[PDB]
Design a protein around this ligand. Structure first.
Ligand SMILES: NC(=O)c1ccc[n+]([C@@H]2O[C@H](COP(=O)([O-])OP(=O)(O)OC[C@H]3O[C@@H](n4cnc5c(N)ncnc54)[C@H](O)[C@@H]3O)[C@@H](O)[C@H]2O)c1
Lengths: 251, 251
């Protein structure tokens, strides 16, 4: 894959933008300045082969970068990037990882280490399905752990209930592996929202299949659990993009 | 009013973020680099009293910053910021001024010139109600004109149809003064979307009142014209935030 151009300039430009202007009434500022944060991010992978990473690599960066998160507002998602972010509505209804400082700075970017100066590969990065599991998941897995550990009160999890190749919930997704196990006693409830894509076969249902496995897990942690398929608020967002869909007919 | 801190760093940070990562398949890049744009911008207002700006002050800045705009996707909005940006969908369905480079860079920011070094005031700015209209409007007014001038094909205009105190179309709004007067013959049609807020009394309707004045003005510019109230796709977006409103009942 093609690495992000001007990585340091982009990281630093997003960081300063976020610091001064973004999520001011939703998330707290971090103590560390943008240059300290860059130093922690870069040392996680620089001057190393591109797959020489593990879950501990970005430890200092995520420590510096972590924010206290709004109680009852944390959301996770798997398989539903646009619908989850459209619904969270840039922190107004829920926070996603990608609205927090480390998530916002690195969202959509591509980078990797190399041993030779300048310590990072400006030409090519591995498909990363290519590196071993602990390396491929080093950055977003630590991102997910740290974010989960900071969640408080009700947490929401949006999943795709219409994908015949990928269960709504799986033990090895970033949420499965780094989210749920890292929810603490500050969390009171996991609220699942199952998306049923308009015009598509329903594959997964609350109370059955992988959602029942998730339910059992949630309860084993002593959180409450609820699950809803296409709640009206989410259904109308879907309809907005597909207003003639059968599901959208009004009275 | 307190000005944005670290204005230069914010502007440049936003400009680098946008250049490398934002609207990449939706809007073109600008030839000027971020440093050159900052110089143009700073030059427009600095070492002048804030009440001495006019519609020419940022002319050179907008000249450098102006992107060619995708045919048929240009949208104007009045009194409906959140609804218009949610519907426009960060450039995917429509472009707004706030998705373009200069609008993105200065959106929400607050700044002012001053006569002493360093030529701008980093700590306090005058409420703009104290200055002449042409100075209050010098930046966003030139922004809207430049943006209007670049529009081609069908343009869309989203208006509030449910304010008893503020007509859907006013000659003295930004669209009235800087948007419509500045549409060229590359524009073929103005399409009006009238927003009726859920649970509010309907004030304005297509073909009547200020909307008929606007219809007549558009036609006298030889643009085609159409007008809709709460088109399904827009209504569904409203409904997502108020699913239990009467207007949102499903079949
Ligand atoms: N913003 C990001 O780039 C990003 C990346 C990973 C994880 N996360 C966080 O963790 C959760 C999403 O991750 P998840 O695994 O639960 O859901 P998911 O399966 O939707 O994965 C999210 C990202 O990981 C990649 N991915 C997913 N399946 C893949 C596959 N089998 N092969 C190769 N790449 C694949 C995709 O690029 C996708 O953008 C969210 O809460 C999110 O905040 C975010």
């Amino acid at each position: 894959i093609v690495p992000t151009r001007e990585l340091e300039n982009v990281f630093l430009g997003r960081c300063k933008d976020y610091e001064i202007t973004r999520y001011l009434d939703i998330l707290p500022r971090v103590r560390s300045d943008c240059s300290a944060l860059w130093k922690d991010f870069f040392k996680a992978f620089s001057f190393k082969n591109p797959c020489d990473l593990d879950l501990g690599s970005y430890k200092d960066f995520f420590t510096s970068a972590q924010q206290q998160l709004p109680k009852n507002k944390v959301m996770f998602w798997s398989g539903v990037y646009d619908e989850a972010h459209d619904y969270a509505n840039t922190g107004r209804k829920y926070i996603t990882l990608e609205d927090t400082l480390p998530g916002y700075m690195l969202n959509s970017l591509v980078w990797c280490g190399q041993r030779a100066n300048p310590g990072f590969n400006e030409k090519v990065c591995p498909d990363f399905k290519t590196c071993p599991v602990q390396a491929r998941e080093s950055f977003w897995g630590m991102a997910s752990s740290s974010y989960a550990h900071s969640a408080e009160g009700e947490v929401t999890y949006m999943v795709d209930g219409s994908n015949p190749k990928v269960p709504a919930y799986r033990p090895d997704s970033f949420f499965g592996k780094y989210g749920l196990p890292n929810l603490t006693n500050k969390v009171t409830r996991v609220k699942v929202i199952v998306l049923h894509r308009l015009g598509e076969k329903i594959i997964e249902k609350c109370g059955a299949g992988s959602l029942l496995d998730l339910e059992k897990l949630v309860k084993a942690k002593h959180f409450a659990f609820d699950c809803v398929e296409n709640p009206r608020a989410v259904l109308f967002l879907l309809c907005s993009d597909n207003p003639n869909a059968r599901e959208c007919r009004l009275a």
